[PDB]
Amino acid sequence: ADLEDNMHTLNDNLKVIEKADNATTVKDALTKMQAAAQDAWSATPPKLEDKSPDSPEMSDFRCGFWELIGQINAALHLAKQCKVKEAQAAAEQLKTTCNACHQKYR
Amino acid sequence: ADLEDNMHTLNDNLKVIEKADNATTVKDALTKMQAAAQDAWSATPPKLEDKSPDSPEMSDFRCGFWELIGQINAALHLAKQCKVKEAQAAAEQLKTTCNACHQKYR
Amino acid sequence: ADLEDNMHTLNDNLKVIEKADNATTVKDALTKMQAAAQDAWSATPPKLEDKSPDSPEMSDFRCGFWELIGQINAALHLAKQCKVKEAQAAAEQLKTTCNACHQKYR
Amino acid sequence: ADLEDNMHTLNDNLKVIEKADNATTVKDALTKMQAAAQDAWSATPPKLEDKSPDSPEMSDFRCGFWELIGQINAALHLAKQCKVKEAQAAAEQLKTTCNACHQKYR
Amino acid sequence: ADLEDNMHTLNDNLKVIEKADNATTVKDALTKMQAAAQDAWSATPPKLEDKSPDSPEMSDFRCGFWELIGQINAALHLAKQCKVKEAQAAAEQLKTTCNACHQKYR
Amino acid sequence: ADLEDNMHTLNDNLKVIEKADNATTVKDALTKMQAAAQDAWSATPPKLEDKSPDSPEMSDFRCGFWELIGQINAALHLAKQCKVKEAQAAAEQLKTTCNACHQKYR
Amino acid sequence: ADLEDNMHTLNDNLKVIEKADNATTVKDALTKMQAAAQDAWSATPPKLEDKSPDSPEMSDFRCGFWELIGQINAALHLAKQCKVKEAQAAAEQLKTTCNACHQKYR
Amino acid sequence: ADLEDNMHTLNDNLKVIEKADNATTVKDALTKMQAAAQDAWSATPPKLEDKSPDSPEMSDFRCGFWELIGQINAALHLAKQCKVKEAQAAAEQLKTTCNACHQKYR
Amino acid sequence: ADLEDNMHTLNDNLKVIEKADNATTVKDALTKMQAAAQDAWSATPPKLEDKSPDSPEMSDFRCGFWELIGQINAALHLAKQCKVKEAQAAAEQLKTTCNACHQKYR
Amino acid sequence: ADLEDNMHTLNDNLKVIEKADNATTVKDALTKMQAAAQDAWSATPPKLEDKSPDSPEMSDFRCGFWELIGQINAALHLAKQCKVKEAQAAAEQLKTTCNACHQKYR
Amino acid sequence: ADLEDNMHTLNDNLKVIEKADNATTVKDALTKMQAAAQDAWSATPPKLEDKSPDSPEMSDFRCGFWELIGQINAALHLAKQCKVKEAQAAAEQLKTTCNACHQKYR
Amino acid sequence: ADLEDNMHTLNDNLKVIEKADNATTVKDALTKMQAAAQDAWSATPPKLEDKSPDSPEMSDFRCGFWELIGQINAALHLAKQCKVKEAQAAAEQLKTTCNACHQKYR
Numbered sequence A, B, C, D, E, F, G, H, I, J, K, L: 001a002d003l004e005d006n007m008h009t010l011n012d013n014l015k016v017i018e019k020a021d022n023a024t025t026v027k028d029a030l031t032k033m034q035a036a037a038q039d040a041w042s043a044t045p046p047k048l049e050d051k052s053p054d055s056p057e058m059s060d061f062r063c064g065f066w067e068l069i070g071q072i073n074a075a076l077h078l079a080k081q082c083k084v085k086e087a088q089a090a091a092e093q094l095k096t097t098c099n100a101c102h103q104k105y106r
Ligand code: HEC
Pocket: A003, A004, A007, A008, A010, A011, A014, A045, A046, A060, A061, A062, A063, A064, A065, A068, A094, A095, A097, A098, A099, A101, A102, A105, A106
């Protein structure tokens, strides 16, 4: 998937999680998010296409994705314990990480 | 597994490695440690529950876990070459990384 | 594989990619590079054997390998879309990351 | 996934297919559509919740989905032969089946 | 399995579902029902042996089995969301399809 | 395989079954027919290329293939019970389903 | 499955074996009995719910189930050699093991 | 794992089960106990190293482990039905089997 | 395999173990012995054919096989730790169990 | 499959290859040819039934099949590199090996 | 297995086939012979240890084993068609290939 | 991989084997050589591109590769028994086969 498609997967699955009422739907959505983020961390955002690959910006992009992966993993961990509301709250807190990256590079 | 259970897995398997006398027992123990550390790096320690997820502390927690993973992988690499004493010595050196994190966040 | 063998795998596969004329050969070569880099990031270079594992040098070594992994993943992503010339150009740009690390630690 | 989510998947993947430039993207998108249609054909749409399961309406609903599945399969058959433009044209033509069902039951 | 044995499987598993108190038991029973229905839909029942394979009676028979499969799938979808009572109600609802076919052909 | 290839596979395997003398050969042949029919039911025959995808012709074509699949499955069921002659007789009778569709659409 | 369900499975499959006419049906039925007995041997029958887990009754119950498993395995071995009538006769003789346990604990 | 390690595993997982608040944790812990007991039943405890392999003592040792395995399996059967509190009570009751063997052979 | 053939397998593999000079050969032989013992324990030997299946003789026969399986497992556990000489000594030790059963029933 | 049926498979798939317009169709046909050749090389053809199995004629027959297998592998290697026209030319070239054997033994 | 072990396996399984009364036993035995021959063809017999690896002797040895493999495969093909007596007769005839090689190199 | 790359693989792995100090490295290297030789035996070397596929030269080329495969398999058989020095000596001896073919066809 291309970077924009991975972002759309992330966005769609937050909506699924928010409206879900059981752990299976939540786990499935978080698993799709994990895969999208694992594909996206190695991408180059359009606004950074002219920057050195080892630039502070590109390193910060990767770091932010690795942090998002950690938070998705932790939300999935709650969902695998069947803690639906807690997993949903963790997914809501994810948005702060999405937004922080977007402010810099989207 | 919860964070404390992953730590207990790490602790138990260092003891197994120290007393082991063959590469199979060592490889098995290191594989369990690898899995425990892969589950733990995305956790939030109790003493950091009120901190921002992107805080210097939380980033340092993750970094320390990624370093521990690298050292476990390298010890496993020795054990897979059947170098039992060298793998045991690498596992002993792991303790410095465990202790360094504990001084800050346990 | 030992560190030097992983480097040889990386070097051999850049040569394969450069001369290739189809996506299958390129994808295969990049997959071998991905595996070599995943094995190598946890190694200790000979020139850093006496340094603390958490030293700035060792952390920089790991970081550089994680960056190389990201660039390999991205080249593979192009090749999986069958974009042979673009994947070859991405592999050529990899060399800057190889060389930057070598200047410091080889 | 619930019926609304499966419909969203179908729509998203039509857009991916239309903008695609390689067979890998197209095949993956059509495979996702196949999965969504296989999940959806046994669902009950809101407007038919009070009808007999063997009503003309529910039978017509199932028949339209089996039609859609066949057309997706045919498009995927083109994409597996790497015929990107032909598979894109088949995907565009699917829309008549989407619209026919929506006119009756959405 | 022969037709009568597949029917006995369907009947046994509806009773298991009704008595169940958790989603695992329900899911396991519905999966057995799926398999029995997949194996039965292509059979010729005793009272239709002297009809043409393309006869309206045989076509009606196959159609009824396909509607049964859809309803079993829909009940399984609820059970996979851990909705035990809803899946149990869906399982009672599919008795309508059992009954309709039996009325004509058992 | 295109529709013509799938029809050739069906015809080849009827001949294999007729001349066979053991259940293994018959089961394999019937399994190949099942796969060919599964790939063919979603095709559009040449003489229906100008009909709507939901035309009465196309829906009759699909219905005939589902009939054929059922009769193949039923023959395979006899072969799986090692009833060679009965499975051969069921395969021979398949010809009336082949012929009926051919009269209309071949 | 609970103990009653496992006993129902055992009884259903004895009847399938008795009426069967080929090795495939017999092998499948015996495989289902093996699974039911494997799930049942660890159960506590109602009439022993008040006995110590290590009581002479409970140990006699487990011993009878291991006997039954052995005799099922031996019947399955005959069926796997395609010896239908011999496997049917072995299944019939199983009844003396069923009955002996029932006299004491059912 | 050696006998001492398998005993440690059994003890650790009893504690995990007692403190657990969801079926996933309980099922995983019971699965680990099943594996440890399957490894241990064929071991020779230090105090019996000079006894015949068919001695009353070694036979009693094996019998006690087969008992334990049955009780673990029964507890896991409850946990697979998501019956957390009931599975916890079954795990607590296992301790009588642990203690009975320890009194004789530890 | 029949009982005599499983016995021949056990005998051949003890000799392979004694002559072996490495753990791979020993492990492979012990795994073959496990399979032969698993297949034999449910048989009725010629000298016991006219005994009841629950007779003391048949119970003794099954018990001896279970003790054999435990001893093969214990030897395999040593071989998996690469302890060739210890596994070879364990393999000689299990001749006691072979002999005891043969004394009574061969 | 019997020898004649494996020959028919080889012949059908050469024609599929010639008519193909993409590498997937070619790869699939060559894989079927590999399997048919692997199954045929050990057969005795009618015109050689009264020759010794080590006769020059039978040795020549096996040799020709091994050369065929190599040429099918080499054509498959081209097709895996997506070189459709080159793989098609390699497929025409292997008719020399078909012809040579047929000259002597068909 | 060393060459002597592989030859013992070949001889054991000829005897199993000769005394067998069903296709399952024959197929298994022939499958074990196939594996033994596959492991043996690359060996160097004692009486050729002093010959060049490419000597006429060693190449004749390899050729005889490829002959044997072909005849084993052909016997297995008959067994897979459930032709027990024909497969037994093919196995008996294998002895002329065994004997021819033994006369030269055993 | 093309023929030149497979030759490079063979040469690289001889060097890995010669410098190795453990069986894991040796086994992996020999496995890679086996794969390279299996790919290469069906290739056509540049100097033989104008020869008949059944020419003495091409037949000799295939025969030399089958020899090489046998010798690699024999070396791997030693390495699987953990006989590092013996496997290294077998790998060194392979070189005579490499050189014999190169003298004729490189
Ligand atoms: C950096 C580390 C990011 C994180 C974490 C997330 N996103 Fe993102 N996002 C990022 C970039 C650089 C871009 C621009 C991509 C481009 O090709 O222009 C985006 C874009 C989006 C979009 C818009 C996609 C589109 O159709 O153009 C969405 C909807 C989006 N991102 C959502 C999203 C969510 C929900 C995230 C957290 C769960 C998230 N992103 C993380 C960079 C980064």
